[PDB]
């Protein structure tokens, strides 16, 4: 039943491998100029992912945990 | 205020009595919702998903999954019920009810200044005594068809309508007896639960064979073969490409024709092997070949097979390999290097059924199949889902009964007897754990209470009638759901799985003990 | 235009306020888990930001699940993690001790004593505590299984698994004993890699056991293979058993009619050759970390060989240790020594609705799996954490056979010894020495507080008892709130655990007492 | 004291957008009201005097019809109970083909009377048991109400008379002509073998000339054109090919490797010569029509035009299979010339224009064949769609007649007789289930009531007349549509008969849906969230 993601469960258990010091948190941007001068700077080789949210609305905490 | 809030300002903390109150309230809410599920007299619930899918059910675990709950303690109870369903397949509603009643009875004494540790100690002592009594009360018995029928009825009647339960009992018991080997563990994968959506709910039945959800892909294939040889194979009869980037080079159209003709020789060799085997096996028109292939078959091979009067199916399920090798009796082949007549299955009837755009193939009249299929019929999707859940519960119950010859009388009789045994054992417990033992007994008493309430009778009056009858007579009298009078569960035919009761006791006691000892709930992962 | 020397977001805090804040943060971190110490500890519920629930009274898990902003709290959490990794026990004890020492240091810091004097006094006291702890220790015969079981019991009476104590102790002792290995003159335990804990929700806890082998969540590739082999000869592999592309670009060019069929037949013949090379050793089970082709399955099946594919590397190493095999990545180089004989039974059985593969009759196995059956996932997670604590304590005892009285006896004895030693200093630094000496009483005090008895009366009685000569083993019965002699109660802890706890707490206090200026807000500049 | 907090327990643990309904008033009565509303929406389109409804779906596509199943499927019903009743109606449509409106009306009436019974004091279990008993009684009674049988399906007149009733409810004005068309189409199909295939009847909708100009063609019509220059064949020799009409190519990858000048010069000549040889080999078998399921190569088209070969390209494989069935050819996978047993034959193939659309016709002279098609004309697309729906209803009625040949009087005669007999039985039954049995009997009155309401007369007078007449014993008497005053007449002479199997299945499905709706006691709806489709 490969259509039902046999490995999904096992990927979930060994995704719980924080191991090292704490688990940190996603970077929070509180200024538009901060966003602009962090995206403009930094090496372009690696990918930058940004999450847009508003407090209270559902569909946010799950994304942050992911 | 709290230390966590001092470190993490936006942290939610419930401390001391607050955490215990929160947990007990959540358990009480879950129990209040799931009370009406218990017993054949329980009420159906309609569950509508976000997309609008409709599901009618009475299963406790199914209801828990579809309940729109966002509570931690409810999540823990749901995980416990999920484990209970996974291992035994029954008792989820009883699991939740017993957990909630245990927590409520424990709170009844904790609110009087008692420490939860003493209540947990009493719970452990009562669990030990109750397990001893359950071992003392079970009815060890070699199980013929009658006892299995009774157990399957006791489950399916609680799950579905009475007439549907009557049909499903024969279906499930016959299927289990068909696939059961002597002194061997029962493999439930060998019973295929296929659902079709055209007939009424009472037309579901058992086929001593196999049913496939796909049919022949060539319009010229035979639609019904009387005497069939089954060739179960896992060989890709469709076209394949070289692993090493082959490519073709030619200088003229004739060379292109030659290369095109010569590119299918590899597959044509396998097809020729199959054709030669069929010709050698049967030279007349009496018999026939059905070729079930786990991998695809290209149209050229389909045409080549059809010209020889061979019906073939492609893209079958992996479990169907074992199902066919056990039902028809052949050998699943991953290659045709050395194929012999003795590796061919047999089937006394193979025919194809069309339903709308869906296509089905029946493999019937097997000699002595070790793998049967349970065909589910109904006019609605939700009806099919309900019947599927009920059949799962019945199959699990029958398998559990077969596993150990002991069976426990139902209708709450064993709960009442265990409650009286615990009450009598209470003086032997030293200290204030007698309160915990009493709470455990009262919590165990919830099942007859809920059964009587669902049946519509008075709760306390029925319970005291049952208890008085059991005390004066010593028999295992349960709650009759038509009159409310005491009734002997064993004689009537209300049976319960011993493994289900043992798992209920163990899991309920463990989770209640763990919850009672929780004094703080924290969510401090943010910021 | 606001021209500044430093950036706008840079904030600098300095003075006695910084020391007070650090000490208060450490105190509050201690107060987080102050109630989770002793046999009468109460468990806590942690709501994981990923959606899970963690129910435990282990200090390290609770402190790990908490996200904090004050960097002193981060230091304390790192202290908890270090103590957990080094010895596996005493997390709550070390956190509480660090908090108490920082409190008694803040005492003097409020006066006009420089922190360096406190640091020197703390280091002297640490040396004296190490000396006294070594002095009051006793040796242990590791051969006596009863003493080892008693030690593990003392280690696990404070956890939820305490209700099943003999079972857990036997499981941990057997696992640790059979994972013990020695090769090339080097002795190792390696609880992390081998001695796997596999938890399957359902069943009952008393059904949990440690297998004389390895169990994996895998099934046979083809149903026709045997699911029950009496005395298997196991062969392990890494390389796939399927035709694969070469490393270099190897495009072909077909101009003849029979080259396509020849290519496909050559692929089939290569697979057959690999299978024949495997078969030449006449094994019964073939385990591969990677895929096994259907044709390979057929060729193995023709030789009556059970094949299992797609196994994790850690599981394959565990199987190799259990059955005494060697993983071979090239079948043509398979040797007789590589064939794994020593497994006494292989059996694939269905648990619940999912197949499991057992290799569970090995003679002299150097790896094992622990099968946990329980109510649900969270209960089994807590049980696994308790088992980890038990195994860590057992390995600590095996490495160092020294024991120290527990239940507050060690702390009180060390405090009395340091108090007596401090009587002959006559220096400005004797006061912090005495203060950090009596700061060790927080462990008996916490035990009494969690028990529920009166703290002041019991603690005074315990101090009076310890002022006598031969009373180093007098501690607090954490269940009844009475003074007992722990050579009678039987609570003992490894000397390594106590030494690590004391060292880590003292150096946490030292590290947090050297700070008097906090600057924050600057970029990483990476 | 200004706000009422949520009750502790399940009420507080509920999600944000979720809704919970429990008890009689909150759940069962509301479900009954929703089902009654759905039945009310569909009620007015029942019987010959039913009214078409312009229904516009979310895709802004207009549907005008009185088919209950189509109306229900074109409405995004939101209430789960009405969803269940719609599922029952669709199941009835799939199983039989006609009777969806009967299912919906009967379910609505049953649920309304169940609500009344619950209000007067009965329990849900008692009502469900009473309905099950009454449904079993009705299924027992139904075989005794059969008036006549089909007794012949190869005849045109008898089949037309049988099919007139089914397609009289839809397109009431002109039912004889449509009955004749569908009768001819079904009689051409349905060979001596008893098996009848509904899919063998094709419908082609060509606009322009009014529905009275429709006809039946023994063959197929494709709204396409001919690729080649030939547009008419009189002794058709179709040679169907499932492969593209082009030289085949390698499946992995083919590159023309040229190493000398002569190969480069001769490649195109050789390829063209090979194409010509293949096409001439095809033509030498006497084939003059070629039907291909793939693309047509330019050189292949030229060489086919050279040898006077008609080219027809079918885009869909289903059309290719249907043409093979209706001609007698085998879908070849290569350009090899067809052998005699694979050789397709037809009486005439030509290119014709009907209205303003060019069509290719495969016409059989004989009144027989595997597949027959109905060329539908009309002045509007929606009108032709309604005629197609009526044709589907008639064909399904013919299929049911093939399966079961028994017929019962229509126009409310069967419903009134069933109600009378079930009421008579319910009096003899003691206990509390007699009320449920009597209400089940009364629920049958919704059919004659709907017919009378749609016809424009007083329903009460019609129902009283029907009860009286059935009281003497004329059990084949229903209301007269062609009358401005409430009146009744015998349906056997009028030939207003509906299939017994349809009535049986419709009653079973309606009762099952009503009972299943009644069984529900609690509803836990989730937040609708998204769900684009
Ligand atoms: N016919 C009957 N008469 C009396 N008691 C019954 C009858 N059938 C079932 N029971 C009792 O009612 C209970 C039904 O439980 P059930 O609703 O199946 O909960 P779960 O689904 O959690 O097992 C069983 O414990 C059984 O003992
Ligand atoms: N039965 C007991 N009575 C008194 N003290 C005990 C008992 N069991 C353990 N202890 C003491 O409790 C301490 C262990 O506490 P624990 O909860 O394990 O903290 P940690 O998890 O940080 O090790 C040890 O110092 C031990 O001496
Ligand atoms: N000429 C007629 N006179 C009286 N009643 C008729 C006539 N033709 C059809 N009917 C009735 O109309 C009903 C059919 O209604 P219809 O709109 O087809 O709904 P459904 O599609 O659900 O059957 C049948 O029960 C039949 O008795
Ligand atoms: Mg049950
Ligand atoms: Mg510890
Ligand atoms: Mg109709």
**CB of B451 closer than 6 angstroms to any ligand 1 atom:** yes
Mutation to probe ligand 3, out of D173, D390, D410, D501 (largest number of atoms < 8 A from CB): D410
B224-225: strand order across its sheet: B210-212, B358-364, B349-355, B224-225
Contact C49 A65 (CB under 8 A): yes
Q: Does A13 touch chain C (CB under 8 A)?
A: no
CA angle B443, B446, B452 (to 5 degrees): 165
Q: List the beta strands (DSSP E) in C434-494.
A: 474-477, 482-485, 492-494
Residue B360 Cα distances to B198, B297, B330, B370, D506, angstroms: 13, 18, 21, 21, 26
- Three-state SS for B457? coil
In this structure, the strands spanning B210-212 and B477-479 are unpaired
Q: Which helix (H) or strand (E) holds D401?
A: helix D381-403
Residue B497 Cα distances to B475, C349, C353, angstroms: 19, 22, 18
State the helix-helix crossing angle for C442-451 and C409-421, rounded to 10 degrees.
150
d(CA D452, CA A62): 59
DSSP 8-state secondary structure symbol assigned to residue B111: T
B286 annotated among ligand-binding-site residues: no
Q: Which helix (H) or strand (E) holds B46?
A: strand B44-48
d(CA C526, CA A42): 9
**CB of B411 closer than 6 angstroms to any ligand 1 atom:** yes
d(CA C517, CA D91): 78
Output b/e per residue, C497-523; b: 16+ Cβ within 10 A.
bbbbbbbbbbbbbbebbeeeebeeeee
d(CA D140, CA C514): 96
B4, B72, B322 ranked by CB distance to C223: nearest: B322
CB distance C117 to C360 below 8 Å: no
User: From the candidates C56, C389, C446, C508, which is the catalytic residue?
Assistant: C389
B436 annotated among ligand-binding-site residues: no
**CB of B57 closer than 6 angstroms to any ligand 1 atom:** no
Closest CA to A66 of A45, A47, A48, A51: A51
Give the residue ranges of DSSP H helices in C251-376.
Answer: 259-279, 294-301, 313-323
Residues 6+ apart with CB under 8 A from D261: none
Dist. CA C17 → ligand 5 center (Å): 34
DSSP 8-state secondary structure symbol assigned to residue A29: P
Q: Give chain A positions within 8 Å (CB) of C77.
A: 22
In this structure, the strands spanning B349-355 and B358-364 are antiparallel
Contact A21 C78 (CB under 8 A): yes
Q: How far apart are the first and last CA of chain A?
A: 25
R_g of chain D computed on alpha carbons: 30
Name residues 50-109 of chain D within 8 A of B (Cβ): 78, 80, 83-84, 87-88, 91, 94-95
D240 burial type by CB count under 10 A (0-12 exposed, 13-18 middle, 19+ buried): buried
Tracing tokens 């998204």 back to the chain, one arrives at D530
Residues near ligand 5 ion, CB 5 Å cutoff: C 89
Output b/e per residue, D423-443; b: 16+ Cβ within 10 A.
bebbeebeeebbbbbbbbbbb
Concatenating the DSSP letter of every residue in C88-119 gives SS-HHHHHHHHHHHHHHHHHHHHTT--HHHHH
Residues 6+ apart with CB under 8 A from B430: none
Give the residue ranges of DSSP H helices in B206-264.
Answer: 253-262
CB distance B400 to B497 below 8 Å: yes
Inter-chain contacts counted by CB atoms under 8 A, chains A and C? 17
Tokens of B156: 């399916």
Residues 6+ apart with CB under 8 A from D466: D412, D413, D416, D448, D477, D478, D479, D488
d(CA C381, CA B418): 31
Q: Neighbouring chains of A at 3+ CB pairs within 8 Å?
A: C
Dist. CA C93 → ligand 5 center (Å): 8
Q: Which helix (H) or strand (E) holds D268?
A: helix D261-283
d(CA B376, CA B204): 5
CB distance C468 to C378 below 8 Å: no
CA angle B238, B241, B246 (to 5 degrees): 155
Residues 6+ apart with CB under 8 A from B153: B165, B166, B169, B493
Q: Give chain B positions within 8 Å (CB) of D78.
A: 52
| Active-site residue flag, B462 | no
Q: Give chain B positions within 8 Å (CB) of C379.
A: 510-511, 514
Q: How was this structure determined?
A: cryo-EM
CB distance B205 to B264 below 8 Å: no
Residues 6+ apart with CB under 8 A from D382: D62, D63, D64
Name residues 203-232 of chain C within 8 A of A (Cβ): 217
d(CA D265, CA D273): 14
**In a mutagenesis test of the A interface, which of C48, C50, C378, C522 is the best target, namely the one with the most A β-carbons within 10 Å?**
C50
Residue B177 Cα distances to B181, B369, D445, angstroms: 8, 11, 49
CB atoms within 10 A of CB D225: 16
C67, C160, C378 ranked by CB distance to B8: nearest: C67
d(CA B522, CA C148): 36
| Active-site residue flag, C485 | no
d(CA B300, CA B272): 12
What values do phi and psi take at B165, rounded to 5? -65, -40
Contact C74 A25 (CB under 8 A): no
- Three-state SS for D237? coil
d(CA B78, CA B62): 10
Q: State how far Cα D289 lies from the chain centre.
A: 34
Residue D44 Cα distances to A24, D35, D50, D95, D446, angstroms: 66, 15, 6, 24, 12
B495-497: strand order across its sheet: B139-140, B406-409, B495-497
Tokens of C131: 């000396």
A18, A22, A62 ranked by CB distance to C77: nearest: A22
R_g of chain B computed on alpha carbons: 30
Strand partners, C210: C370
d(CA C455, CA C435): 19
How many residues belong to chain C? Answer: 526
d(CA D330, CA D325): 8
Tokens of B275: 């054709």
Q: Does C111 touch chain A (CB under 8 A)?
A: no
**In a mutagenesis test of the C interface, which of B334, B393, B433 is the best target, namely the one with the most C β-carbons within 10 Å?**
B334
Q: Give chain B positions within 8 Å (CB) of C244.
A: 243
Q: State how far Cα B237 lies from the chain centre.
A: 36
What values do phi and psi take at C405, rounded to 5? -60, 140
Ligand 2, residue C493: give the atom nearest the CA: 27
Q: Is the dihedral of CA C407, C413, C415, C416 positive or negative?
A: positive
CB distance D463 to D415 below 8 Å: no
How many residues belong to chain A? Answer: 66
B322, B337, B519 ranked by CB distance to C42: nearest: B519
Residues 6+ apart with CB under 8 A from B316: B212, B214, B292, B293, B294
Dist. CA C38 → ligand 2 center (Å): 4
Residue B217 Cα distances to B54, B210, B292, C97, D287, angstroms: 33, 19, 12, 76, 28
User: What is the chain C residue with the closest CA to A18?
Assistant: C64
- Cα pseudo-dihedral C69, C71, C73, C79, rounded to 10: 140
d(CA C266, CA C254): 15
Ligand having the closest approach to the CA of B154: 1
Q: State how far Cα B44 lies from the chain centre.
A: 19
d(CA C208, CA C193): 20
Concatenating the DSSP letter of every residue in C191-242 gives TTTSSEEEEEEBS-GGG-EE-SSEEES---SSTTS-SEESS--EEEE-S-BS
Name residues 23-62 of chain A within 8 A of C (Cβ): 23, 25, 61-62
Q: Does C77 touch chain A (CB under 8 A)?
A: yes
In this structure, the strands spanning D357-363 and D310-313 are unpaired
- Three-state SS for D196? coil
CB atoms within 10 A of CB D195: 7
State the helix-helix crossing angle for D500-519 and D80-95, rounded to 10 degrees.
160
| Active-site residue flag, B284 | no
Residue B424 Cα distances to B101, B126, B427, B509, angstroms: 20, 11, 7, 20
Dist. CA D490 → ligand 3 center (Å): 15
d(CA D216, CA D452): 35
d(CA D290, CA D226): 10
Q: Does C526 touch chain A (CB under 8 A)?
A: no
Q: How far is C130 from chain B (nearest CA, A)?
A: 32
Strand partners, B227: B287
Strand partners, C186: C183
Tokens of B193: 């639960």
CB distance D448 to D466 below 8 Å: yes
Dist. CA C41 → ligand 2 center (Å): 9
Mutation to probe ligand 3, out of D390, D496, D507 (largest number of atoms < 8 A from CB): D496
CB distance C235 to C346 below 8 Å: no
What values do phi and psi take at C438, rounded to 5? -75, -10
State the helix-helix crossing angle for C377-399 and B72-87, rounded to 10 degrees.
90
Tokens of C412: 């009180």
Q: Which helix (H) or strand (E) holds B248?
A: strand B248-250
How many residues belong to chain B? Answer: 527
R_g of chain A computed on alpha carbons: 17
Closest CA to B98 of B492, B473, B450, B433: B450
- Three-state SS for B87? helix
Q: How far is C296 from chain B (nearest CA, A)?
A: 9
C350 burial type by CB count under 10 A (0-12 exposed, 13-18 middle, 19+ buried): middle
Tokens of B192: 């295929």
Residue nearest to atom 18 of ligand 2 (CA): C158
Q: Does C51 touch chain A (CB under 8 A)?
A: yes
CB distance D505 to D99 below 8 Å: yes
Tokens of B22: 């929160």
CA angle B143, B144, B145 (to 5 degrees): 120
d(CA D278, CA D248): 11
Q: Give chain B positions within 8 Å (CB) of D9.
A: 25, 28-29, 32
Output b/e per residue, B143-182; b: 16+ Cβ within 10 A.
beeebbbbbbbbbbbbbbbeebbbbbbebbbbbbebbbee
Q: State how far Cα B411 lies from the chain centre.
A: 22
Resolution in A: 3.0
d(CA C77, CA C65): 10
Residue nearest to atom 18 of ligand 3 (CA): D169
Number of H helices, E strands in chain B: 19, 21
B526 burial type by CB count under 10 A (0-12 exposed, 13-18 middle, 19+ buried): middle
Concatenating the DSSP letter of every residue in B307-376 gives TTTEEEE-S--SHHHHHHHHHT----BS--TT--GGG-EEESEEEEEEETTEEEEEEE--SS-S--EEEE
| Active-site residue flag, B393 | yes
C227 burial type by CB count under 10 A (0-12 exposed, 13-18 middle, 19+ buried): middle
Residue C254 Cα distances to B255, C233, D254, angstroms: 12, 44, 10
d(CA C195, CA C391): 9
Name residues 238-297 of chain B within 8 A of C (Cβ): 240, 242-250, 258-259, 261-263, 265-266, 269
Q: Which protein residues touch ligand 2 with a CB less than 6 Å away?
A: C 37-39, 41, 59, 89-93, 157-158, 406-407, 447, 476-479, 491, 493
User: From the candidates C56, C84, C91, C132, which is the catalytic residue?
Assistant: C91
Residues after which chain C has a gap (C–N > 2.5 Å): none
CB distance C64 to C80 below 8 Å: yes
In this structure, the strands spanning B477-479 and B486-488 are antiparallel
Output b/e per residue, D17-54; b: 16+ Cβ within 10 A.
ebebbbeeeebbeebbbbbbebbebbbbbbbbbbebbe
């Amino acid at each position: 039943f490969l259509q039902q993601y046999r490995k999904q469960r096992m990927e979930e258990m060994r995704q719980q491998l924080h191991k090292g010091p704490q688990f940190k948190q996603v970077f929070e941007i509180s200024s538009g100029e901060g966003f602009l001068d962090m995206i403009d700077k930094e090496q372009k080789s690696i990918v930058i992912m940004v999450h847009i949210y508003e407090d209270g609305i559902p569909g946010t905490e799950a994304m942050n945990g992911c | 205020m709290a230390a966590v809030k001092t470190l993490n300002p936006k942290a939610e903390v419930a401390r001391a009595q607050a955490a215990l109150a929160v947990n007990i309230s959540a358990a009480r809410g879950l129990q209040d919702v799931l009370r009406t599920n218990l017993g054949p007299k329980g009420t159906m619930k309609m569950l509508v998903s976000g997309a609008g899918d409709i599901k009618l059910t009475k299963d406790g675990n199914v209801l828990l999954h579809e309940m729109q709950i966002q509570h931690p303690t409810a999540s823990l109870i749901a995980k416990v019920a999920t484990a209970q369903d996974d291992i035994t397949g029954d008792g989820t509603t009883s699991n939740v009810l017993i957990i909630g009643e245990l927590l409520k009875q424990a709170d009844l004494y904790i609110s009087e200044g008692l420490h939860p540790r003493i209540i947990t100690e009493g719970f452990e002592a009562a669990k030990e005594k109750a397990l001893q009594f359950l071992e003392e009360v079970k009815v060890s018995r070699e199980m013929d068809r009658e006892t299995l029928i009774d157990v399957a009825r006791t489950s399916l009647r609680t799950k579905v309508h009475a007439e549907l339960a009557d049909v499903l009992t024969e279906a499930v018991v016959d299927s289990i007896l068909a696939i059961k080997k002597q002194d061997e563990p029962i493999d439930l994968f060998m019973i295929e639960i296929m659902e079709m959506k055209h007939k009424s709910e009472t037309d579901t039945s058992l086929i001593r064979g196999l049913v496939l959800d796909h049919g022949a892909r060539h319009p010229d294939m035979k639609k019904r073969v009387e005497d069939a040889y089954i060739l179960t194979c896992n060989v890709s009869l469709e076209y394949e490409k070289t692993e090493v980037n082959s490519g073709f080079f030619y200088k003229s159209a004739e060379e292109r024709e030659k290369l095109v003709k010569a590119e299918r020789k590899f597959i044509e060799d396998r097809v020729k092997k199959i054709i030669e085997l069929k010709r050698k096996v049967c030279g007349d028109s009496d018999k026939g070949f059905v070729v079930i292939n786990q991998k695809g078959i290209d149209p050229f091979s389909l045409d080549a097979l059809s010209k020889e009067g061979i019906v073939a199916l492609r893209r079958a399920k992996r479990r169907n390999m074992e199902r066919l090798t056990l039902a028809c009796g052949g050998v699943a082949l991953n290659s045709f290097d050395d194929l012999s007549p003795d590796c061919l299955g047999h089937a006394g009837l193979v025919y194809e059924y069309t339903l709308g755009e869906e296509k089905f193939t029946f493999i019937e009249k097997c000699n002595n199949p070790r793998s049967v299929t349970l065909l589910i019929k109904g006019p609605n999707k939700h009806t099919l889902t309900q019947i599927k859940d009920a059949v799962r519960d019945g199959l699990r119950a029958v398998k559990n009964a077969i596993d150990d010859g002991c069976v426990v009388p139902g209708a709450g009789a064993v709960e009442v007897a265990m409650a009286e045994a615990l009450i009598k054992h209470k003086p032997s417990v030293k200290g204030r754990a007698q309160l915990g033992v009493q709470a455990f007994a009262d919590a165990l008493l919830i099942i007859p209470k809920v059964l009587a309430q669902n049946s519509g009778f008075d709760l306390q009056e029925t319970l005291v009638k049952i208890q008085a009858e059991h005390s004066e007579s010593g028999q295992l009298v349960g709650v009759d759901l038509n009159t409310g009078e005491p009734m002997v569960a064993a004689e009537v035919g209300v049976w319960d799985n011993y493994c289900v009761k043992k798992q209920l006791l163990h899991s309920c006691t463990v989770i209640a003990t763990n919850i009672l000892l929780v004094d703080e709930i924290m969510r401090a992962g943010m910021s | 235009r606001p021209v500044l020397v430093l950036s706008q977001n840079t904030k600098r805090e300095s003075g006695r306020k910084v020391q007070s804040g650090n000490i208060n943060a450490a105190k509050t971190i201690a107060d987080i888990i102050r109630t989770c110490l002793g046999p009468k500890s109460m468990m806590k519920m942690l709501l994981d930001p990923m959606g899970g629930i963690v129910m435990t009274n282990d200090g390290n898990a609770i402190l790990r699940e908490i996200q904090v902003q004050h960097p002193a709290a981060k230091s304390m959490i790192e202290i908890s993690r270090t103590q957990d990794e080094e010895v596996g026990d005493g997390t709550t004890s070390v956190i509480i001790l660090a908090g108490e020492m920082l409190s008694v240091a803040e005492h003097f810091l409020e006066q006009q004593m420089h922190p360096t004097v406190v640091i020197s006094a703390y280091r002297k006291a640490l040396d004296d505590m190490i000396s006294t702890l070594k002095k009051i220790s006793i040796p242990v015969d590791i051969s006596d299984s009863d003493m080892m079981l008693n030690i593990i019991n003392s280690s696990i009476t404070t956890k939820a698994i305490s209700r099943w104590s003999s079972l857990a102790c036997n499981i941990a002792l057997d696992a640790v004993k059979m994972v013990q290995f020695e090769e090339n003159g080097r002795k190792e335990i390696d609880i992390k890699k081998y001695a796997r804990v596999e938890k399957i929700p359902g069943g009952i806890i008393e059904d949990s056991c440690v297998l004389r082998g390895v169990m994996i969540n895998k099934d046979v590739t083809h149903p026709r293979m045997r699911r029950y082999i009496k005395n298997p000869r196991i062969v392990l592999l890494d390389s796939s058993l399927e035709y694969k592309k070469g490393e270099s670009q190897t495009d072909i060019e077909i101009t003849r009619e029979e080259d396509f069929t020849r290519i496909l037949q050559m692929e089939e013949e290569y697979i057959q050759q690999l299978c024949e090379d495997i078969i030449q050793l006449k094994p019964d089970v073939v385990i591969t970390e990677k895929g096994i082709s259907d044709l390979a399955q057929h060729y193995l099946m023709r030789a009556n060989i059970t094949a299992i594919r797609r196994v994790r590397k850690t599981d394959n190493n565990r199987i190799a240790r259990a059955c005494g095999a060697r993983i071979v990545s090239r079948p043509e180089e398979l040797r007789e020594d590589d064939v794994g004989t020593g497994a006494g039974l292989l059996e694939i059985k269905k648990i619940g609705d999912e197949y499991f593969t057992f290799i569970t009759d090995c003679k002299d196995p150097k790896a094992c799996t622990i099968l946990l059956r329980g109510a649900s996932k969270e209960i089994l997670s807590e049980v696994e954490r308790n088992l980890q604590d038990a195994m860590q304590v057992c390995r600590n005892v095996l490495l160092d056979p020294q024991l120290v009285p527990g239940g507050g006896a060690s702390e009180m004895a060390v405090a009395h010894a340091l108090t007596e030693k401090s009587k002959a200093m006559t220096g400005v630094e004797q006061w912090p020495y005495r203060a950090v000496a009596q700061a060790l009483e927080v462990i008996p005090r916490t035990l009494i507080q969690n028990c529920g008895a009166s703290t002041i009366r019991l603690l005074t009685s315990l101090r009076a008892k310890h002022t006598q000569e031969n009373c180093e083993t007098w501690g607090v019965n954490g269940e009844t709130g009475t003074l007992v002699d722990m050579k009678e109660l039987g609570i003992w802890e490894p000397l390594a655990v106590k030494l690590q706890t004391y060292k880590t707490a003292v150096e946490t206090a030292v590290l947090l007492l050297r700070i008097d200026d906090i600057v924050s807000g600057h970029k990483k500049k990476g | 004291a200004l706000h009422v907090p949520k009750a502790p327990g399940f009420a507080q643990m509920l999600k944000e957008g979720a809704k919970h309904f429990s008890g009689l008033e909150e759940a069962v009565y509301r479900n009954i009201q929703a089902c009654k509303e759905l039945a009310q929406t569909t009620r007015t389109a029942y019987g010959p005097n039913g009214m078409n409804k312009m229904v516009i779906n979310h895709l802004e596509k207009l549907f005008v019809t009185n088919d209950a199943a189509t109306i229900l499927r074109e409405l995004e019903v939101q209430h789960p109970a009405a969803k269940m009743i719609v599922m029952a109606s669709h199941m009835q449509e799939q199983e039989v083909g006609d009777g969806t409106n009967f299912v919906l009306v009967f379910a609505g009436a049953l649920l309304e009377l169940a609500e009344e019974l619950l209000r007067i004091g009965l329990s849900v279990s008692e009502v469900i048991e009473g309905y099950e008993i009454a449904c079993r009684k009705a299924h027992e009674i139904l075989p005794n109400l059969v008036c006549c049988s089909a007794k012949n399906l190869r005849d045109i007149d008898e089949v037309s008379s049988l099919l007139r009733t089914s397609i009289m409810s839809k397109q009431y004005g002109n039912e004889v002509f449509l009955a004749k068309l569908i009768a001819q189409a079904c009689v051409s199909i349905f060979p001596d073998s008893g098996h009848f295939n509904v899919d063998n009847i094709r419908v082609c909708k060509i606009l322009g000339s009014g529905i009275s100009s429709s006809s039946v063609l023994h063959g197929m019509v494709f709204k396409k054109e001919t690729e080649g220059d030939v547009t008419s064949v009189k002794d058709a020799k179709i040679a169907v090919y499932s492969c593209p009409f082009d030289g085949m190519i390698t499946e992995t990858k083919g590159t023309v490797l040229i190493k000398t000048a002569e190969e480069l010069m001769n490649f195109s000549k050789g390829e063209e010569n090979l194409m010509d040889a293949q096409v001439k080999a095809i033509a030498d078998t006497g084939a003059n029509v070629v039907v291909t399921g793939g693309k047509v190569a330019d050189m292949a088209l030229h060489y086919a035009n050279k040898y006077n070969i008609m080219l027809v390209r079918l885009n869909s494989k289903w059309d290719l299979r249907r043409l093979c069935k209706t001609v007698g050819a085998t879908a070849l996978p290569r350009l090899t010339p067809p052998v005699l047993e694979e050789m397709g034959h037809c009486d005439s193939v030509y290119l014709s224009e009907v209205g303003d659309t060019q069509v290719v016709v495969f016409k059989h002279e004989k009144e027989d064949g595997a597949i027959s098609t109905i060329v539908l004309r009309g002045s509007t697309d929606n009108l032709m769609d309604d005629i197609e729906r009526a044709v589907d209803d008639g064909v399904n009625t013919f299929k049911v007649l093939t399966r079961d040949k028994r017929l019962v009087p229509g126009g409310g005669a069967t419903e009134i007789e069933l109600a009378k007999q079930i009421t008579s039985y319910g009096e003899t039954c003691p206990g509390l289930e007699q009320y449920a049995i009597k209400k089940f009997a009364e629920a049958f009155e919704a059919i004659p009531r709907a017919l009378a309401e749609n016809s424009g007369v007083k329903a009460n007078e019609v129902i009283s007349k029907l009860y009286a007449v059935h009281q003497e014993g004329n059990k084949n008497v229903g209301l007269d549509i062609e009358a401005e005053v409430p009146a009744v007449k015998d349906m056997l002479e009028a030939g207003i008969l509906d299939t017994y199997l349809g009535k049986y299945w419709a009653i079973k499905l309606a009762t099952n849906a009503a009972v299943t709706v009644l069984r529900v006691d609690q509803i836990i709806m989730a937040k609708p969230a998204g769900g684009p489709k």
